Design a protein around this ligand. Structure first.
Ligand SMILES: Cc1nc2ccccc2c(-c2ccc3c(c2)CCCO3)c1[C@H](OC(C)(C)C)C(=O)O
Ligand SMILES: Cc1nc2ccccc2c(-c2ccc3c(c2)CCCO3)c1[C@H](OC(C)(C)C)C(=O)O
Ligand SMILES: [Mg+2]
Ligand SMILES: [Mg+2]
Lengths: 131, 131
């Protein structure tokens, strides 16, 4: 179903990477964050919700969504309640960038553009079809 | 044409807001950045290019794209070479958030979801149709 996303954090090089997966297509977005915090999670959700029609969000760590900040983002935005593949791509491209965050965006790009349609095409098709 | 984006920075409260507009649909993405720098512009482009099929980028300040960092992002990603409306929405929502960056994501959301279809729907339709 088109309005469902999963959100989790992973760790790499002593930093945190927030990873959202659009479950039906396999499309991802990701950001490197200072801290695994309610505030970064909330902020990220607001950005996500402005781009795609986000209806529900799931996570593998339910305590992620406990803060007042997250609940306030989900309320305002109307929302209700690849780790290893991505780390694989990141490791393939890692020597070509100085900052981890650059390598992560490189790996998101590679992941979303790779064919079997690509995840980036699937999301847009799934969402356009649902309009 | 579906692969064309415009990118510019504006200023507000002594901060910089990077604003990308998908020209055919009127869809926007935006981020608050510390400095108007080549590095932030490059990083932003990499993120943008991983989400949408970005073919060409325009700007109102051509010197924006002069750095080695920007040229390197555009090379790697395969890329070639609302200010007032957004500031209007930001001013409408500004008292409801503590940080400017929150208000900016609120205004992006409001802008992309507002009907005459919404910009968020137009982009996905335009892009799906082009696949
Ligand atoms: C600092 C901060 N503190 C809070 C304390 C508890 C109440 C929620 C918040 C939110 C938040 C605020 C507004 C908001 C959304 C989430 C959702 C959108 C409508 O308004 C923020 C915001 O900052 C973060 C997003 C970084 C957490 C803010 O800038 O105001
Ligand atoms: C610090 C930095 N310095 C440079 C000096 C000149 C050469 C380009 C860069 C780039 C850049 C790097 C790789 C890259 C793209 C842009 C495009 C993608 C393929 O690799 C970066 C990157 O950092 C920023 C993105 C913040 C500028 C980096 O992390 O390596
Ligand atoms: Mg997690
Ligand atoms: Mg500018």
């Amino acid at each position: 179903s088109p309005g469902i996303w999963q959100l989790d954090c992973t760790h790499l090089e002593g930093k945190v990477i927030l990873v959202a997966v659009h479950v039906a297509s396999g499309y991802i977005e990701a950001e490197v964050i200072p801290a695994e915090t309610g505030q970064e999670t909330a902020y990220f959700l607001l950005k996500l919700a402005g781009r795609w029609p986000v209806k529900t969000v799931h996570t593998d760590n339910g305590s992620n969504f406990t803060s007042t900040t997250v609940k306030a983002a989900c309320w305002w935005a109307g929302i209700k309640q690849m780790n290893k593949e991505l780390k694989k791509i990141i490791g393939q491209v890692r020597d070509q960038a100085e900052h981890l965050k650059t390598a992560v965006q490189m790996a998101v790009f590679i992941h979303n553009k790779k064919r079997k349609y690509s995840a980036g095409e699937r999301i847009v098709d799934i969402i356009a079809t649902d309009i």
